[PDB]
Design a protein around this motif. Structure first.
Motif, PDB file in Angstrom:
ATOM      1  N   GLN A  13     -24.939 106.917  49.749  1.00  0.00           N
ATOM      2  CA  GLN A  13     -25.361 105.550  49.205  1.00  0.00           C
ATOM      3  C   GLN A  13     -25.188 104.467  50.162  1.00  0.00           C
ATOM      4  O   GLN A  13     -24.620 104.561  51.533  1.00  0.00           O
ATOM      5  CB  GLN A  13     -24.349 105.375  48.157  1.00  0.00           C
ATOM      6  CG  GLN A  13     -22.748 105.206  48.446  1.00  0.00           C
ATOM      7  CD  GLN A  13     -22.093 104.866  47.150  1.00  0.00           C
ATOM      8  OE1 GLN A  13     -22.274 104.277  46.074  1.00  0.00           O
ATOM      9  NE2 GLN A  13     -20.827 105.225  47.049  1.00  0.00           N
ATOM     10  N   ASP A  14     -25.400 103.288  49.871  1.00  0.00           N
ATOM     11  CA  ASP A  14     -25.479 102.121  50.694  1.00  0.00           C
ATOM     12  C   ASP A  14     -24.215 101.604  50.285  1.00  0.00           C
ATOM     13  O   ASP A  14     -23.929 100.786  49.290  1.00  0.00           O
ATOM     14  CB  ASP A  14     -26.276 101.007  50.289  1.00  0.00           C
ATOM     15  CG  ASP A  14     -27.803 101.262  50.840  1.00  0.00           C
ATOM     16  OD1 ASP A  14     -28.897 101.452  49.970  1.00  0.00           O
ATOM     17  OD2 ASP A  14     -28.295 101.302  51.922  1.00  0.00           O
ATOM     18  N   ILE A  69     -31.173 107.340  52.632  1.00  0.00           N
ATOM     19  CA  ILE A  69     -30.671 105.881  52.231  1.00  0.00           C
ATOM     20  C   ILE A  69     -31.054 104.970  53.321  1.00  0.00           C
ATOM     21  O   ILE A  69     -31.355 104.043  53.251  1.00  0.00           O
ATOM     22  CB  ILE A  69     -29.167 105.952  52.324  1.00  0.00           C
ATOM     23  CG1 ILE A  69     -28.535 106.730  51.085  1.00  0.00           C
ATOM     24  CG2 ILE A  69     -28.501 104.436  52.541  1.00  0.00           C
ATOM     25  CD1 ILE A  69     -29.248 105.764  49.935  1.00  0.00           C
ATOM     26  N   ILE A  72     -35.822 105.724  53.378  1.00  0.00           N
ATOM     27  CA  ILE A  72     -36.705 105.282  52.286  1.00  0.00           C
ATOM     28  C   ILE A  72     -36.126 103.953  51.533  1.00  0.00           C
ATOM     29  O   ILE A  72     -37.115 102.983  51.328  1.00  0.00           O
ATOM     30  CB  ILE A  72     -36.654 106.482  51.216  1.00  0.00           C
ATOM     31  CG1 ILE A  72     -37.041 107.765  51.500  1.00  0.00           C
ATOM     32  CG2 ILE A  72     -37.210 105.967  49.736  1.00  0.00           C
ATOM     33  CD1 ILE A  72     -38.118 107.557  52.937  1.00  0.00           C
ATOM     34  N   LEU A  75     -38.166 100.569  49.620  1.00  0.00           N
ATOM     35  CA  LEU A  75     -37.773 100.540  48.390  1.00  0.00           C
ATOM     36  C   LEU A  75     -37.126  99.242  47.840  1.00  0.00           C
ATOM     37  O   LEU A  75     -37.316  98.452  46.876  1.00  0.00           O
ATOM     38  CB  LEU A  75     -37.190 101.742  47.536  1.00  0.00           C
ATOM     39  CG  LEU A  75     -38.103 102.931  47.465  1.00  0.00           C
ATOM     40  CD1 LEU A  75     -37.410 103.692  46.222  1.00  0.00           C
ATOM     41  CD2 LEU A  75     -39.531 102.863  47.195  1.00  0.00           C
ATOM     42  N   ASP A  76     -36.369  98.648  48.658  1.00  0.00           N
ATOM     43  CA  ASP A  76     -35.554  97.482  48.535  1.00  0.00           C
ATOM     44  C   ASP A  76     -36.463  96.407  48.056  1.00  0.00           C
ATOM     45  O   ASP A  76     -37.461  96.126  48.540  1.00  0.00           O
ATOM     46  CB  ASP A  76     -34.965  97.056  49.804  1.00  0.00           C
ATOM     47  CG  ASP A  76     -33.388  96.554  49.775  1.00  0.00           C
ATOM     48  OD1 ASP A  76     -33.265  95.601  48.731  1.00  0.00           O
ATOM     49  OD2 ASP A  76     -32.695  97.334  50.353  1.00  0.00           O
ATOM     50  N   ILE A  79     -38.331  98.308  43.396  1.00  0.00           N
ATOM     51  CA  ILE A  79     -37.931  98.886  42.318  1.00  0.00           C
ATOM     52  C   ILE A  79     -36.342  98.423  42.015  1.00  0.00           C
ATOM     53  O   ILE A  79     -35.551  98.188  42.749  1.00  0.00           O
ATOM     54  CB  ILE A  79     -37.798 100.427  42.254  1.00  0.00           C
ATOM     55  CG1 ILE A  79     -36.854 101.081  43.139  1.00  0.00           C
ATOM     56  CG2 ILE A  79     -39.253 100.946  42.827  1.00  0.00           C
ATOM     57  CD1 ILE A  79     -36.816 102.471  43.084  1.00  0.00           C
ATOM     58  N   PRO A  80     -36.221  98.307  40.642  1.00  0.00           N
ATOM     59  CA  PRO A  80     -34.808  98.064  40.285  1.00  0.00           C
ATOM     60  C   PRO A  80     -33.842  98.969  40.468  1.00  0.00           C
ATOM     61  O   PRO A  80     -33.905 100.250  40.364  1.00  0.00           O
ATOM     62  CB  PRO A  80     -34.995  97.889  38.683  1.00  0.00           C
ATOM     63  CG  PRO A  80     -36.131  98.699  38.292  1.00  0.00           C
ATOM     64  CD  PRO A  80     -36.865  98.561  39.465  1.00  0.00           C
ATOM     65  N   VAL A  81     -32.648  98.684  41.108  1.00  0.00           N
ATOM     66  CA  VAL A  81     -31.875  99.465  41.412  1.00  0.00           C
ATOM     67  C   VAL A  81     -30.856  99.995  40.283  1.00  0.00           C
ATOM     68  O   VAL A  81     -30.423  99.215  39.520  1.00  0.00           O
ATOM     69  CB  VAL A  81     -30.762  98.775  42.471  1.00  0.00           C
ATOM     70  CG1 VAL A  81     -29.629  99.848  42.896  1.00  0.00           C
ATOM     71  CG2 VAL A  81     -31.320  98.312  43.614  1.00  0.00           C
ATOM     72  N   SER A  82     -30.624 101.314  40.181  1.00  0.00           N
ATOM     73  CA  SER A  82     -29.983 101.944  38.906  1.00  0.00           C
ATOM     74  C   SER A  82     -28.450 101.551  39.071  1.00  0.00           C
ATOM     75  O   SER A  82     -27.823 101.642  40.016  1.00  0.00           O
ATOM     76  CB  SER A  82     -30.042 103.631  38.797  1.00  0.00           C
ATOM     77  OG  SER A  82     -30.400 103.944  37.929  1.00  0.00           O
ATOM     78  N   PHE A 112     -21.562 103.840  38.365  1.00  0.00           N
ATOM     79  CA  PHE A 112     -22.772 104.035  39.006  1.00  0.00           C
ATOM     80  C   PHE A 112     -23.325 102.814  39.668  1.00  0.00           C
ATOM     81  O   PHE A 112     -23.680 101.662  38.940  1.00  0.00           O
ATOM     82  CB  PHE A 112     -23.994 104.477  38.191  1.00  0.00           C
ATOM     83  CG  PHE A 112     -25.108 105.501  39.212  1.00  0.00           C
ATOM     84  CD1 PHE A 112     -25.019 106.767  39.212  1.00  0.00           C
ATOM     85  CD2 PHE A 112     -26.199 104.433  39.472  1.00  0.00           C
ATOM     86  CE1 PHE A 112     -26.247 107.338  40.043  1.00  0.00           C
ATOM     87  CE2 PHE A 112     -27.087 105.125  40.340  1.00  0.00           C
ATOM     88  CZ  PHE A 112     -27.195 106.474  40.870  1.00  0.00           C
ATOM     89  N   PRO A 113     -23.346 102.627  40.953  1.00  0.00           N
ATOM     90  CA  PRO A 113     -23.071 103.572  42.121  1.00  0.00           C
ATOM     91  C   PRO A 113     -21.524 104.027  41.938  1.00  0.00           C
ATOM     92  O   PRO A 113     -20.510 103.389  41.369  1.00  0.00           O
ATOM     93  CB  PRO A 113     -23.419 102.984  43.461  1.00  0.00           C
ATOM     94  CG  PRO A 113     -23.448 101.351  43.006  1.00  0.00           C
ATOM     95  CD  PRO A 113     -23.781 101.298  41.688  1.00  0.00           C
ATOM     96  N   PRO A 114     -21.343 105.025  42.604  1.00  0.00           N
ATOM     97  CA  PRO A 114     -19.905 105.525  42.662  1.00  0.00           C
ATOM     98  C   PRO A 114     -18.818 104.885  43.760  1.00  0.00           C
ATOM     99  O   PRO A 114     -18.435 105.313  44.644  1.00  0.00           O
ATOM    100  CB  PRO A 114     -19.966 106.951  43.038  1.00  0.00           C
ATOM    101  CG  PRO A 114     -21.370 107.064  43.825  1.00  0.00           C
ATOM    102  CD  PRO A 114     -22.063 106.039  43.434  1.00  0.00           C
TER     103      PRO A 114
END
Lengths: 184, 183
Positions: A13-14, A69, A72, A75-76, A79-82, A112-114
């Protein structure tokens, strides 16, 4: 002859940890990968014997994960970040019995995120010691965690599990009070 | 964002590989997975396609996705220890603050430290089974490969009565009985 599932989840992840790897037998964690020492760490002592497996694919998976990460940004903002709000549950490993050694458990799901930190408080004051926090992936691309705290329950007690969804995304508290204790 | 490269292995009690999976996801979206029949990563949309093609160009991975044999050899050293693993439960009965009932007394049968998670609990008043209640209880995982539950019994105290909690679990040969009596 029942069928069991072995989960091997490489995720990244970021944020920290930038990359992780988790393995489970059915719903229970077997190992978690320490990417500093670059070794598998057993959840339990009895698994220590197979944490030195070397025929392990991981590097490729690890690298491809990070590549996503980093490559791709495209996408920033598109799309809405989960994001899932962490849910903390607190309870004791064994049934309550004052003066008898026990251990407090703080189960965190829907993470989420972890990215998380879990702190313990005794009567609104940070605890003297600490315990381990094992984060693991569960089926469904989601995460969870178990934080433990050894202690001896007393009637006046009040403990609280403070889970912060790092960094300051959201903070959840879960209280625990000794009720319906067992006779001695 | 968060991304995954998750592999799964479906093996039977005997350590026989039954199924294997290798999927890629981004933003908690399953994008592409390995198709054994087509021997290549297939979308599960543009990103998904770009990712299946990007990975389909690496022969190392293509030859690796031997998925079923890897599952077998990798788990072989420990699989048996896991599928044969059990730990019997501990059970205790004590009174607890009654709730959702008109009865003046509520018992609580505590069952903890057992593995696997499957367990059944029934009560017996003076040797006779009681009440439609789900005997196949759901359990809370402690995270250390042990579980715990509790069964509640609402009742009206009678000094001669003897209530018994009957716990059945694979980790123990014979059923476990825990008696309780007023006072």
């Amino acid at each position: 002859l029942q069928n069991h599932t072995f989960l091997h989840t490489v995720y990244c992840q970021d944020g920290s940890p930038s990359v992780g790897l988790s393995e489970a037998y059915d719903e229970d964690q077997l190992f978690f990968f320490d990417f500093s020492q670059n070794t598998r760490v057993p959840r339990l002592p009895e698994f220590a014997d197979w944490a030195q497996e070397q025929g392990d694919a991981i590097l490729f998976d690890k690298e491809f994960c990070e590549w996503m990460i980093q490559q791709i940004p495209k996408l920033d903002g598109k799309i809405p970040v989960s994001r899932g709000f962490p849910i903390a549950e607190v309870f004791t490993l064994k049934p309550l019995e004052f003066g008898k050694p026990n251990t407090l458990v703080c189960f965190v799901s829907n993470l989420f995120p972890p990215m998380l930190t879990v702190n313990w408080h005794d009567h609104s004051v940070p605890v003297e010691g600490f315990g381990p926090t094992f984060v693991s992936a569960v089926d469904g691309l989601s995460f969870q965690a178990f934080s433990y705290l050894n202690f001896t329950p007393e009637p006046s007690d009040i403990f609280s599990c403070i889970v912060t969804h790092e960094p300051d995304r959201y903070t959840a508290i879960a209280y625990w009070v000794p009720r319906n204790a067992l006779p001695s | 964002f968060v991304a995954h490269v998750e592999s799964t292995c479906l093996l039977d009690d005997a350590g026989t590989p039954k199924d294997f999976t290798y999927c890629i996801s981004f933003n908690k979206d399953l994008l592409t997975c390995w198709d054994p029949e087509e021997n290549k990563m297939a979308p599960c949309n543009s990103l998904a396609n770009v990712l299946s093609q990007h990975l389909n160009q690496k022969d190392t991975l293509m030859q690796r996705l031997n998925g079923l044999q890897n599952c077998a050899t990798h788990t072989q050293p420990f699989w048996g220890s896991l599928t044969n693993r059990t730990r019997p439960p501990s059970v205790q009965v004590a009174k607890t603050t009654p709730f959702n009932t008109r009865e003046p007394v509520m018992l609580a049968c505590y069952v903890w430290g057992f593995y696997p998670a499957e367990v059944t609990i029934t009560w017996r008043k003076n040797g006779k089974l009681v009440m439609h209640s789900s005997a196949h209880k759901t359990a809370q995982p402690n995270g250390d490969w042990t579980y715990q539950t509790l069964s509640h019994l609402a009742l009206t105290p009678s000094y001669g009565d003897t209530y018994t909690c009957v716990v059945e679990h694979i980790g123990a040969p014979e059923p476990i009985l825990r008696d309780w009596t007023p006072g």
